[PDB]
Amino acid sequence: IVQGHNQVIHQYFDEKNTSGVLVIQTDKKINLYGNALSRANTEYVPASTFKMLNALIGLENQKTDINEIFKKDMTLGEAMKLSAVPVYQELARRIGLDLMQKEVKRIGFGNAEIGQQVDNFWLVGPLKVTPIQEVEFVSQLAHTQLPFSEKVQANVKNMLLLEESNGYKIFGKTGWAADIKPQVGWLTGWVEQPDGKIVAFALNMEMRSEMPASIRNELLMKSLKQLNII
Numbered sequence: 001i002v003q004g005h006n007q008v009i010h011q012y013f014d015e016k017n018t019s020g021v022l023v024i025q026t027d028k029k030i031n032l033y034g035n036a037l038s039r040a041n042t043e044y045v046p047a048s049t050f051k052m053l054n055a056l057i058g059l060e061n062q063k064t065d066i067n068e069i070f071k072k073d074m075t076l077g078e079a080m081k082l083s084a085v086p087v088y089q090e091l092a093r094r095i096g097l098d099l100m101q102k103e104v105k106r107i108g109f110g111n112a113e114i115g116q117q118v119d120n121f122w123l124v125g126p127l128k129v130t131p132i133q134e135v136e137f138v139s140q141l142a143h144t145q146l147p148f149s150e151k152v153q154a155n156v157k158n159m160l161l162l163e164e165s166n167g168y169k170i171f172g173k174t175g176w177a178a179d180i181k182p183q184v185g186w187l188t189g190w191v192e193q194p195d196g197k198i199v200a201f202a203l204n205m206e207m208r209s210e211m212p213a214s215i216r217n218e219l220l221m222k223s224l225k226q227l228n229i230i
């Protein structure tokens with residue numbers, strides 16, 4: 001885990017007047033970029049990035065399936081990108097506290113502590129995770145190396161497609177914990193390059209209420225281009 005060639009990307013974060021880190025994981029190597037590199041090994045609430053693990057747990061334990069319509073009426077996959085209806089809260093209650101805690105410990109996600117409220121522990125605590133831990137988790141998902149069904153991992157990966165450009169596929173999940181102080185913003189995912197190679201990323205930055213949600217994607221894309229990952 002090493003600071004990368006950071007001269008330019010550091011300035012990208014500086015221009016937004018906030019602190020952020022970008023963690024990049026290729027085969028074996030992790031590199032750190034941004035203007036607040038200590039964030040990479042700092043624990044934060046995962047916020048909506050936990051939807052990835054919620055979905056894996058719910059699908060693996062047959063508490064839902066990819067075709068179920070949650071009463072706008074929505075599937076699990078549509079709810080991955082949009083939060084108009086509380087699908088993942090409902091799924092967490094179906095899973096229940098016992099099974100959720102067992103699965104979170106089996107995966108070893110972050111500090112693996114979910115407390116006693118099964119439907120909000122990922123937003124206000126006590127569950128916390130570092131950006132390095134998030135990039136390792138999503139790298140395992142991208143490579144079908146998590147200890148879940150191969151089909152479940154493929155189904156969750158398919159829910160996470162963000163953009164496709166000139167043969168590159170960008171997968172990922174945003175999160176924003178706006179009700180804690182300081183606010184935390186996430187964009188965690190991976191690039192599938194045209195030849196099949198995977199480069200995983202975790203962007204983590206301090207948010208403020210006036211920022212557009214798209215600031216995370218903007219910083220990510222500019223940085224990935226500067227690093228020649230896309």
Ligand SMILES: *C(=O)[C@@H]([C@@H]1NC(C(=O)O)=C(S[C@H]2CN[C@@H](C(=O)N(C)C)C2)[C@@H]1C)[C@@H](C)O
Binds near residue numbers: 123174175
């Ligand atoms: C997950 O972190 C939350 C979910 N994700 C998300 C995002 O990453 O952009 C938004 S939070 C952010 C968007 N606008 C602000 C807002 O208050 N709402 C439109 C609700 C905050 C979205 C709510 C959530 C499921 O925890």
